[PDB]
Design a protein around this ligand. Sequence first.
Ligand SMILES: O=C1N[C@H](c2c(CNCCCCCCNCc3[nH]c4ccccc4c3[C@H]3NC(=O)c4ccc(O)cc43)[nH]c3ccccc23)c2cc(O)ccc21
Ligand SMILES: Nc1nc2c(ncn2[C@@H]2O[C@H](COP(=O)(O)OP(=O)(O)CP(=O)(O)O)[C@@H](O)[C@H]2O)c(=O)[nH]1
Ligand SMILES: Nc1nc2c(ncn2[C@@H]2O[C@H](COP(=O)(O)OP(=O)(O)CP(=O)(O)O)[C@@H](O)[C@H]2O)c(=O)[nH]1
Ligand SMILES: [Mg+2]
Ligand SMILES: [Mg+2]
Lengths: 167, 167
Amino acid sequence: MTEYKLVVVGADGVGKSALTIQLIQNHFVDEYDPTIEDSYRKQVVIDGETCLLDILDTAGQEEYSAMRDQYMRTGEGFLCVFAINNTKSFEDIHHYREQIKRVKDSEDVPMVLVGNKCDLPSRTVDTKQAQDLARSYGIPFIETSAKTRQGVDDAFYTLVREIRKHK
Amino acid sequence: MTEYKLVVVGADGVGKSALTIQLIQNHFVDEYDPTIEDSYRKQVVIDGETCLLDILDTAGQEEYSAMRDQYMRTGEGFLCVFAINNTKSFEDIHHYREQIKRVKDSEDVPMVLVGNKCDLPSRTVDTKQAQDLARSYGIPFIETSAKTRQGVDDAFYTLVREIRKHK
Ligand SMILES: O=C1N[C@H](c2c(CNCCCCCCNCc3[nH]c4ccccc4c3[C@H]3NC(=O)c4ccc(O)cc43)[nH]c3ccccc23)c2cc(O)ccc21
Ligand SMILES: Nc1nc2c(ncn2[C@@H]2O[C@H](COP(=O)(O)OP(=O)(O)CP(=O)(O)O)[C@@H](O)[C@H]2O)c(=O)[nH]1
Ligand SMILES: Nc1nc2c(ncn2[C@@H]2O[C@H](COP(=O)(O)OP(=O)(O)CP(=O)(O)O)[C@@H](O)[C@H]2O)c(=O)[nH]1
Ligand SMILES: [Mg+2]
Ligand SMILES: [Mg+2]
């Protein structure tokens, strides 16, 4: 069985854990419990192929910024998550992408730009701006909601297709 | 900060995942999703000491019986779980105990016997029988419910106290 090593990255509070928990447990976590580092091994069927997703739910807190190098080295694909109502989280994407590109020593790293909390009316980042940034990176962009499940399966499955399309 | 590697072991369906998820997320999972291998890191305060719990939620399914050797070598303490309404799960306990003791080459391995699903009225395993088995092992015995949260914090904290004694 083919294994896919996925890493969920982004600023503290964007919904990395809620997106991961929504995908696996089909429920929305309203509580904010800062992550140190959690991992999940889940068997899924993507495009008729049964595969194992090894998902790493990382810390957004800058206090764990030294843990990054090792998980970026072993990670095969990166879900770069920002919140559509948090401008700093969108700006932080560039830093996460540059660090991934540095560690991996490649400009062609499987990545998906994720604009989470798309259920919220308090938007600060235009869809077109996020789309343009994803285009400058040459990566897909998906708007998601860990609450409604909108784009959640699509974000994770697109990332697997990116790793597969790269291999 | 002191780290404690905790391994949750036991028969398929005893509530290893529900106990782990209840401890960390303060949420009861009603669904039965067989585990491959999940890991969680949680910062807690035990007896005035701030520590990090590195919890491995293992597969109860006999199909992943080869994965055991590695995590039994690195695991510092083991939560051995059975369900009070499942006689076979209680009988399987001695097999987990005997494998841990074999891999560690010691009869003094930090362990806690856990009697889960104590919220259920359909009991088939007597508390006295489980207490007597824990006594033959020289380990603590705690009855728990991943649904009500009864004994959950006590089971994990007792295990940490067991590792601290051994160290
Ligand atoms: O020595 C062991 N440590 C593991 C363990 C953990 C940490 N859990 C995770 C597991 C790790 C495996 C790898 C693929 N599963 C974890 C996983 N999924 C990923 C997805 C993307 C990128 C990296 C990873 C990783 C990690 N693998 C790396 O190389 C790596 C680099 C930097 C990271 O920060 C994270 C990872 N907690 C425990 C508590 C008690 C007992 C054992 C443990 C473990 C498990 C096991 O069955 C047998 C032995 C061990
Ligand atoms: N409305 C809405 N709220 C969300 C969404 N995703 C996450 N949240 C909320 O945002 C808060 C933070 O979510 P969380 O999943 O813990 O974010 P995180 O990026 O993992 C935080 P850390 O980096 O510290 O681990 C929570 O209160 C959660 O309910 C979403 O898609 N929509
Ligand atoms: N009433 C009650 N039900 C429980 C309790 N703990 C677990 N369950 C239920 O038992 C079922 C299986 O629980 P689960 O946590 O997946 O057990 P597991 O030992 O992890 C199964 P696997 O070994 O395959 O990973 C679920 O439906 C769950 O809700 C409990 O304390 N009380
Ligand atoms: Mg988180
Ligand atoms: Mg389980």
